[PDB]
Amino acid sequence: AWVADKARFYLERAAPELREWEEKEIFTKDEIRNLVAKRSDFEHLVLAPGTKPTDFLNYVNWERSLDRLRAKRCARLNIRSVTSHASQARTFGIFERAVLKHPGSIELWLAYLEFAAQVKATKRWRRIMTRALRLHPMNASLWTLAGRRAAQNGDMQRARAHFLRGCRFCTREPTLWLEYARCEMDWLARMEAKKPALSGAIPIAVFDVARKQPFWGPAAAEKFFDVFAKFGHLSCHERIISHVVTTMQELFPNHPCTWSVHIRQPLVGVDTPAFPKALRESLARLKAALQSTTDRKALATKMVAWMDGILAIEKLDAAIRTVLEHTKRSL
Amino acid sequence: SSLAQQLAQIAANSRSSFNVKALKASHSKSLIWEPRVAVSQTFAEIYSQCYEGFKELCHLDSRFVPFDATLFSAQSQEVDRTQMTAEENAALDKRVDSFLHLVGSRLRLMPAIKAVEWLIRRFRIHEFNTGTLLATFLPYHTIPAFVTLLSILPVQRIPIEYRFLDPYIKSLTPPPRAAIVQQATNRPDLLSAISRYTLDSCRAKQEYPGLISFWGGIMAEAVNGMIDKMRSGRRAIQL
Amino acid sequence: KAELDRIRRYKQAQKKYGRGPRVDIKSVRDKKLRRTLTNLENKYKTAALKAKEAEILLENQTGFLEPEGELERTYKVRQDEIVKEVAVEVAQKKFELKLTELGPYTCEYSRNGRDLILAGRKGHVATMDWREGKLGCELQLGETVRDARFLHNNQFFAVAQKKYVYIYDHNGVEIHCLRKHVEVSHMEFLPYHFLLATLSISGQLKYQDTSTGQIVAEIATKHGTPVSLTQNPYNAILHIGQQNGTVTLWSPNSTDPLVKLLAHRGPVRSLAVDREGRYMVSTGQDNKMCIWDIRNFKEAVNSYFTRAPATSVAISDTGLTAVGWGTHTTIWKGLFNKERPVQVKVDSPYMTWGGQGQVVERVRWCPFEDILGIGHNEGFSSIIVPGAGEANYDALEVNPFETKKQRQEGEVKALLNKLQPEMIALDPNFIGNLDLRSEKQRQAERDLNTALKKYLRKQRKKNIIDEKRLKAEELYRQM
Amino acid sequence: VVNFLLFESAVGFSLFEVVHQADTVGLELPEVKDAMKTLDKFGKMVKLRSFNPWTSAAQGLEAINLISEGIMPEYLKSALEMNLPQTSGKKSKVVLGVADKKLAGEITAAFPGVQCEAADTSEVVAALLRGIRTHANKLHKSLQEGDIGRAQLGLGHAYSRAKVKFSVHKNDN
Amino acid sequence: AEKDAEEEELEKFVLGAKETFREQLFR
Amino acid sequence: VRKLKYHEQKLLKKHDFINYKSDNNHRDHDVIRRYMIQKPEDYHKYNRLCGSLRQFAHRL
Amino acid sequence: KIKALTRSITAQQAPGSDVQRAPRNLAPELHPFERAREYQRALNAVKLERMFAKPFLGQLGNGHVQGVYSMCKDKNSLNCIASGSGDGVVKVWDLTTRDEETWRVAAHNNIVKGLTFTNDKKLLSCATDGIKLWDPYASPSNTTPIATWQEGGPYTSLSFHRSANTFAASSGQGCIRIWDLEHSTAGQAIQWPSFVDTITDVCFNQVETSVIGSVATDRSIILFDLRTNMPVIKTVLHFACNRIVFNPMEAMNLAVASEDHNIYIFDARNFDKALNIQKGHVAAVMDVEFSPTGEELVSGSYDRTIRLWRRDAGHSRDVYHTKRMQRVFRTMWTMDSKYILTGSDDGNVRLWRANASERSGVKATRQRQALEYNNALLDRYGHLPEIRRIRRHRHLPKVVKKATEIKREELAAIKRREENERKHSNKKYEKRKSEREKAVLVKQQ
RNA sequence: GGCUCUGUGGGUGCUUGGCCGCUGGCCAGACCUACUUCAAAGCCACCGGGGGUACCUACCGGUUGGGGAAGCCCUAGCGGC
RNA sequence: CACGCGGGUACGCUAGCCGC
């Protein structure tokens, strides 16, 4: 432990900002003595041998709240000469030696990404995201954060880069695959609302490659359909939904999930006279499904869950509502 | 060795630690944690655990909300009691005595023991308020928490009236009611201290039936033994 | 303008941390020398500027007391009022040791203020850690005791007995006695050199190297027994103070005194000298005390008067001084300000300790706390005075809370950087300056009517004829 | 001159990035051997760049039964594609340090811009991977879930049983 | 007052609250 | 003082705090301790008497 | 308004932490004897570096049988050395495993005068036989060469190009001749037009490609431009030059090791005067080599000494010697610029280190800060008398010490004769010619 | 009721006040920093015995370069011995 | 070159005109 000699540099670096704040009338001298003592205690806690990511986050939160307090006080005392750049630089320094000391803590990596995104640092955010993905490649949350922020920026090629490396790594759970199909169809909806893409064959290709993965269950394909069924206002949405249903019917013929997609298929983009027409079609499918030879307890639990989802909406007729209740109660 | 006697009185009257081993021992003295863990604990960890304890105590009883502002404050994480003046130390002593009178009823509970552990590990109540702390733990003199408080108490910081506890500090066993009653019949100071503690609580209406039954039993047995001592047969001596 | 604060900052830092005027880069004729000296001037300027900017991270605050009303004055403040108004960890340090039967006592702190040694006249020498209240040693020694002094640590101390000095370990076990130092009446330990300098009653001053154990230079002060002795902490030269009334400045590299400041008509009774080496206050037998600028060797102000011949005087880490005369000491604040070019006299003392019949033998400042220890005939008495004491210490030089490992490492580093006793002069930063005679001889070996009568008057007495004198005779004949 | 180095262990394979590389002439010197001993003077040399753990003991078993036979696995190719800068060796190469010579040849044949140095041939990368194997518990401990001892124990048992076919003709208990 | 409540909360969190601790003591 | 290292010892070759060369191998202390002399002054008085006796033998 | 200074021990350790807090005040009142304490630390630094100055590191293998008369490093790799002895056997060494050689062959009949590595992996060697090419790194070991060249007179030295497969061999017919591997057979012979004396050494400039320097026993240096194949400039010095070399960071500076016991640092654009004259030897200088950082020099001399130099020094930084080392013929750095190698006449290749008191490996920060602090402190206070005498004291063998005392006496006598002839002759009314200007006799094109 | 241990006060020499900048004051203190003509006479000043002496120091005698108190004289001067 | 606070064209957002 050379921690005193190690923290001497960070205190001597933070000193001239305190000299500027003392030569302005923004912080008084007793308050600056308090800032000196608090930063000194924080540095000698941070550079200690036995340290913790919560200790690094407490120091980050204190420095960021000091920047916010000085911003409020500077706007109140009407000064424009004092800048926040030194505080952002030292907060980046705290975070860089934080991710040096504890690279295996995703809470601290995500706090670093939240800070770098919040003070408008996109290129630095991309570099931090690359380092975090290299250290935690099995983390679907980090991969979806990278891909969704690249899609939110609009660099769809970079979003596909992050997502295809993520689906190359995370193949135990379906989560990142579902989020990639969600992002690709959101790109398809953006390409539609801007008015290949005319076919929209990429989620069908995602399904065809996902057919051979170690998570490939009927529940996983039902999760694929439950992702796909949102935002039906598209062009090839009926093509995608019909391909999912014929894949599940050709592969898992008598599963309750396949009977559930047989129930809930024809209600794609409905909200309105086309609503109860397709509801009567789907209820015919549902009655045939309930009488048919399938695990009725599993199919009934699926249908009462979907019927709670149905009952969550207003603006319907009471006869339809009470016949949903009557068909619910005997399950 | 008159110089060694004067220096022994100075070292016993001194209060703040002045070398690193003394600071580590005085920080190691705790109620809950073992000493090997309690050396290496900053005042944010202790404040988090003991503020969870005080949140439970303040949800139990309503009248702990001024101590939420003055004793268990996030600023009271940082205050060193040995750096404030005599009037600040006396007002802090009044606040501590009021909290101990308030917390004496719930002291079998682990929230209240966590709150007393915060007072002990921050404000050093076992050194600066040994009288009120020892008196508020005296009605619970049959419990392991009293055994631990007796373990962490300094020896020369106990008042003269409670110096019957020295064999029970040398061998860590809870003292019996026979020992407390016999020292109450022998010393008037211990009986006056117990009665002064419970009357100072009962004037502030922070009584509880354990304390009332404790004081009633010990003053009854102490007046019994005191009459059996005072009886003499000679007329002027019995007068 | 807004840059006026910048120019004021640079003037202040060049005053304080600059340690010299500045290198004149315009007079440099060589080009590579000009750009390297411009580089060096930029580096030294940012060095002083960064030290001044990093003087904000100092933790503690200097203590003080200031009178509020117009009738209230600072010297009428009672110690009970100070103890009531001050914090408790520093109100603990105001104690009093009552040791009556073993002579007037003599206090000396260690140079971090951890342990103090107090020695009675009839033998009772004790070594205590006065804050923690434990005594490291106490021993009785029989015979008289002239002066007791800590060495580099609180491990070894040195006591001046009736004939010799003896140095002792931490437990009081006598390590050895020094037989060359006979009848030592005064001692002073140079801290950075490892020399122990002893004035005998005969007037002989011996410097003994404590680390290696050989006496470096026995100087014999040719005139009289010495009355007092102090030690400049900046030059490590010894201000001894004689009985004819001059103080003389001594150094182990000369048998004559370096300067002799003429002082009071009677003997000087006590001396004290600032830790920056700026000023020296001396108290004489004639009832005056007076201060001197040491860097210019002149008297700063008029002589103050003390109302008795002052037995001791010791000045603090800040500007305070305690002059202890008769049976009560008085503390003065503003005797010598560093910033003022011409000093002014102080009207009233800063604060006075009481005269209640205990004659003051020696006053000493605890080096880092705001207290003052007076050793008197009834024992030791520590009083608290708020303005004194350096508030911010440096943990590399000397540490008031030094652990065992830090004390061991610091003792080894001080042993490695002990200074040789030939590195002692009036200006301690001379190492690397020019030998002007040798430089003139080097440049010589590289490049290769009113006085000419006393010339012949001096050279007619030899009687060597010496052809330059023949030329001078022909010149005198022509004149 | 090494740029990165692979290091495969029972919990997974991690590649370190060297900064302040090792002196190659004074490798047999006592001061450099003491530097390779002490973690406080070898962690200045290595900085952990990437870590890839296994998904399951079946993947770890396939990993040993590919790596010991020599052939590299597809997920090792994946993590090298992710961590190494994509080059072809026409104007700039990347020096990787690997423990085995056959794995070196295969990584160089899969990535043409990566020149691999085997620990069986090169003493610099031999001493450097030796130091990482020495301090491998502390270089990974920020993301080492649990320990390495039981992982090495169970993985050595699974590898030996797959090589021997133990359970199909041990039945007497 | 001329201070926001969010500014006073940031002042109590960042800078300390020693003066109001002494004020809460002396009541 | 701790035990000096190799280079620290080579730079402080002539250093020890305990025994100087003027202490005469602590012969005074060893003789006082052996023969229970309660006064080091009594040791040095006996020693200067023995020295005057030896110089009388030398001039004889 | 009373307030005194209160110090908790929280200012030394906060409770719950093992960090000993060290508060620092940089005011000069607290730190007396600044210059004196720094002088004492500089004196300790000089005595410490004289104690830990231990420069000999090892010896490559069993060595050779007869002396090592040529050796050459691989400028692309870092641990490939080769050395050719006097009985005409060459060995290729690997610096990582110094226990035994990697590849040896009975190359020639006579001594191996020059030797070099190609840029691919192969090595070349001269002799009086003629030059040969081998493949020392092959999966079977082959003793036989894969190319040989005898026409072109008796060759003396080799030098390989930095980038391409070109190399120039200095012959004894007064010409150098330049081959390109894989499409040239006899090479192109470039010569000064009427030149007879042998060209001893040849050196490609590694920074500026296609500039070739050479020395010749006409006490002359000659340049060559490879782009327009002709010589360029020729200057005659006073004594013969043993070896030319170029600076690897400054393209125009060269150094000649010469029989005047001297190293002359020249500028290739202006051969009027020497840029520097390093004079420290006793016998003739056999080999000179710049450091790959371009700021230091090694010279192996014909007496038993290696002398390490800074580039602007003009006098020895270090001298290395050994009773077992018989003469010194070829000294060259490793590409670390930390260790130097010495091919002797005892048949030994020795590995010394430059910066004899500076140990290698990874240092902790408070270790390398102490070393850098000592070096900066010696840079400041190195000229004071005690520090100067301890930093200049080095133990020389008795023959070298006696002969440098004789050389000082003879040089002082020659200076006194010249000064007396100047004071009593007609040369008194002239400007004193500087010694760097006196270093060159004539320059011609 | 007894032994032991500990503490305080008196005594173990013939009784004249607590403190101070003391012929006067104070015990609740008060005022605070002035005033000044001419630095100083010399000597002594304890280390155990025999021995060495390169370096430092002390004492004694000198050598170069400067410096001029004082003594003596007179052509009077920015003087001369 | 730009970097704080307001009303604007515009927000499950901040890109753009002028001020404080």
Side-chain angles (χ1 to χ4, degrees), chain A residues 161-172 174-178 180-183 185 187-191 193-207 209-221 223-225 227-237 239-249 251-270 272-280 282:
Chain A
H162 289 99
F163 268 128
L164 297 210
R165 301 182 207 276
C167 299
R168 187 199 284 166
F169 278 115
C170 300
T171 179
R172 175 143 280 258
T175 303
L176 177 53
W177 293 66
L178 309 168
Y180 175 48
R182 178 189 194 275
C183 171
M185 281 193 69
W187 175 76
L188 217 48
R190 287 164 57 109
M191 287 298 282
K194 270 186 60 182
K195 296 181 173 64
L198 164 73
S199 47
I202 33 166
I204 303 109
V206 163
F207 209 90
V209 187
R211 208 171 60 82
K212 54 195 52 55
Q213 292 296 322
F215 60 88
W216 179 246
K223 284 187 189 74
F224 270 109
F225 166 71
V227 168
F228 286 154
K230 211 187 176 174
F231 41 91
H233 45 85
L234 275 187
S235 277
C236 63
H237 62 96
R239 189 155 85 101
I240 298 154
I241 290 296
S242 50
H243 183 69
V244 164
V245 182
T246 184
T247 307
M248 271 202 276
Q249 278 215 356
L251 270 69
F252 306 131
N254 211 4
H255 200 267
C257 276
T258 319
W259 283 96
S260 168
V261 78
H262 192 198
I263 287 153
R264 304 171 300 142
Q265 176 176 354
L267 311 158
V268 196
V270 304
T272 58
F275 190 65
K277 175 184 193 186
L279 282 185
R280 278 200 277 264
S282 277

Side-chain angles (χ1 to χ4, degrees), chain G residues 131-179 181 183-196 198-200:
Chain G
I131 82 179
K132 288 175 177 186
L133 200 153
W134 291 272
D135 189 4
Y137 299 91
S139 37
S141 177
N142 51 329
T143 61
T144 43
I146 71 173
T148 170
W149 286 278
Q150 314 110 321
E151 302 274 328
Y155 298 98
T156 312
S157 180
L158 295 167
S159 162
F160 211 87
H161 202 198
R162 188 214 158 91
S163 49
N165 270 111
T166 308
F167 76 109
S170 152
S171 87
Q173 296 197 343
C175 48
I176 78 169
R177 62 177 63 243
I178 284 171
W179 284 273
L181 272 307
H183 51 83
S184 184
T185 45
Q188 180 186 20
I190 315 185
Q191 60 183 353
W192 193 260
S194 199
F195 205 65
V196 284
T198 79
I199 296 179
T200 303

Side-chain angles (χ1 to χ4, degrees), chain C residues 127-131 133-137 139-142 144-146 148-163:
Chain C
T127 289
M128 62 210 63
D129 181 17
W130 59 274
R131 312 173 181 186
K134 69 179 180 71
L135 84 171
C137 161
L139 74 178
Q140 306 292 150
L141 290 95
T144 187
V145 167
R146 259 68 158 258
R149 178 62 51 113
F150 269 124
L151 293 198
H152 52 99
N153 286 129
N154 49 356
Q155 307 292 316
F156 311 118
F157 53 93
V159 187
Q161 291 277 84
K162 58 176 302 185
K163 269 170 74 79

Side-chain angles (χ1 to χ4, degrees), chain B residues 39-51 53-55:
Chain B
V39 171
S40 45
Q41 283 186 359
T42 186
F43 280 139
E45 309 182 56
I46 307 160
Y47 188 72
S48 70
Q49 310 272 116
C50 302
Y51 202 48
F54 181 71
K55 275 177 187 173

Side-chain angles (χ1 to χ4, degrees), chain E residues 5-18 20-22 24-27:
Chain E
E6 49 206 270
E7 201 264 353
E8 287 179 1
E9 185 176 1
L10 281 175
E11 184 179 1
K12 275 187 180 173
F13 168 60
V14 174
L15 192 146
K18 183 146 260 175
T20 198
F21 179 81
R22 198 214 181 93
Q24 288 314 101
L25 279 190
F26 286 103
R27 291 298 180 81

